[PDB]
Amino acid sequence: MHLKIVCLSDEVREMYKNHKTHDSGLDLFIVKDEVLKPKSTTFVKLGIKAIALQYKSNYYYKKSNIVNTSFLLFPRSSISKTPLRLANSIGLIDAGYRGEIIAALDNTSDQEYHIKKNDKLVQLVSFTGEPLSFELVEE
Amino acid sequence: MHLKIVCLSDEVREMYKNHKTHHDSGLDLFIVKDEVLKPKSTTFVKLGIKAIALQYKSNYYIVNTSFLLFPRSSISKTPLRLANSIGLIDAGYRGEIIAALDNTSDQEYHIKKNDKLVQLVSFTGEPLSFELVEELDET
Amino acid sequence: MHLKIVCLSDEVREMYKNHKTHHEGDSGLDLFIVKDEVLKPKSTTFVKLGIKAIALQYKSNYYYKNIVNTSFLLFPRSSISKTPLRLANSIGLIDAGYRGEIIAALDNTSDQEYHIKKNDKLVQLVSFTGEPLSFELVEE
Ligand SMILES: O=c1ccn([C@H]2C[C@H](F)[C@@H](COC(c3ccccc3)(c3ccccc3)c3ccccc3)O2)c(=O)[nH]1
Ligand SMILES: O=c1ccn([C@H]2C[C@H](F)[C@@H](COC(c3ccccc3)(c3ccccc3)c3ccccc3)O2)c(=O)[nH]1
Ligand SMILES: O=c1ccn([C@H]2C[C@H](F)[C@@H](COC(c3ccccc3)(c3ccccc3)c3ccccc3)O2)c(=O)[nH]1
Fold this sequence. Notes:
- The structure is a homotrimer.
- Chain A has one helix spanning 10-17, and strands at 2-7, 25-28, 34-36, 40-45, 48-55, 66-69, 71-75, 84-86, 91-93, 102-107, 113-115, 122-125, 133-136.
- The first copy, chain A, has 139 residues and is mostly beta strands.
- Chains in contact: A-B, A-C, B-C.
- Chain A binds chain B through residues 41, 43, 57-62, 69-72, 87-92, 94-95, 104, 106, 126-128, and chain B through 1-2, 24-26, 54-56, 62, 70-73, 75-76, 81-82, 85-86, 104, 119, 121-131.
- Chain C: Pathway: Pyrimidine metabolism; dUMP biosynthesis; dUMP from dCTP (dUTP route): step 2/2.
- Chain C: InterPro entries: dUTPase (IPR008181), dUTPase-like (IPR029054), dUTPase-like_sf (IPR036157), dUTPase_trimeric (IPR033704).
């Protein structure tokens, strides 16, 4: 899968240009420090919009070779140490979505939990589990 | 992928014939009757349908295929969670489809007929089709 | 998909030669708890499944911007839901280059202890295609 990603700020384009360690998942960044209040879910804004592209496949069903596809949003295994849990389990981002990617993070503790810019709680994966590439693009 | 689906009552068949939110890599299933979900419990909610999934044979390393039951993105606005994260429905299954919902709040939670908490999706993430049908080949 | 499991003990190698609940159709390969444990109420325990493993499939073309190894998935079993145990990271994603022990992060959501027994089955391995799975016991 290849992803085209729009950064919603220069700050965010700079952490994506310098993505160090990059797999069948693409780690997304927490982009702004933030406090997640206890026993409640926060819709964390990852400062990014993104289409996913994939080779057209033939499938059973009662215009191009390379198709706009749906993709998934997984919790990173990391999240386990944390009291944050994905409130929708796995994110499913339909092919036609053009909003910002959000991580719906459920804070299970009775305390505040603090996330920080450059934190890594979440990752994008393809329905194939195939390796992911991305380019930075302005629209 | 193509779903053949048996609706287990005329109310439910109504909902699916006039299904006004399926255009899609997922297929929204409806809550079929009002329920109060006890707090901090898990409840097995019956969805009023049997469903078989069909895909072109691949070579691994038309056939019956395994498929998935995802939470809908919008369940995140509630205290409800799929106990089993993502439902895995084997190819051989012909029973009623059921969602295991955890109510994670200290208070009861009400769900209503025509609520859409859950969706069917193919392992490929491809667009889905479905017909309604009076029964499955089971004999 | 095909799996090559190295069991990390002999007691565990036992479990897998005599695997009862896998047969030839399905899409999930059940994994055994491998030793008794108690999980402290309201907590997330890493539970070690006492195996390591690589998956292989017929390679295809993919967009970028024979037999290959591949990423695969650790799902909860349907049956986990009659428990207060939940998979913390929802679905484990295991990358083509993992060569360590399969571990299962389980939250206990109980305000009590929960004893997990050897030969319990809370968790299963699945392929991205949902296709049936073979396994093979291996030492390397
Ligand atoms: O894990 C996911 C899953 C879906 N989405 C996208 C795609 C979906 F159309 C849209 C759903 O938007 C949210 C929503 C909408 C209505 C009711 C509840 C929640 C959403 C975001 C994240 C997870 C689940 C749902 C949303 C979007 C923006 C702000 C708040 C909530 O956001 C994500 O970005 N992350
Ligand atoms: O998310 C899912 C996952 C699987 N299924 C199907 C296929 C599976 F065999 C069967 C699982 O049956 C339940 C079960 C099985 C074993 C141990 C405990 C519970 C089940 C259903 C739904 C979700 C999770 C578990 C079951 C069986 C009878 C009554 C209630 C629940 O139903 C669902 O409909 N939804
Ligand atoms: O469900 C899963 C998901 C991934 N993995 C693999 C791949 C990953 F690098 C490695 C990570 O193991 C844990 C980890 C990673 C980062 C930060 C903390 C902990 C892990 C395992 C299971 C669930 C969540 C996280 C890990 C590693 C060693 C000891 C304990 C836990 O295990 C599993 O075996 N089970």
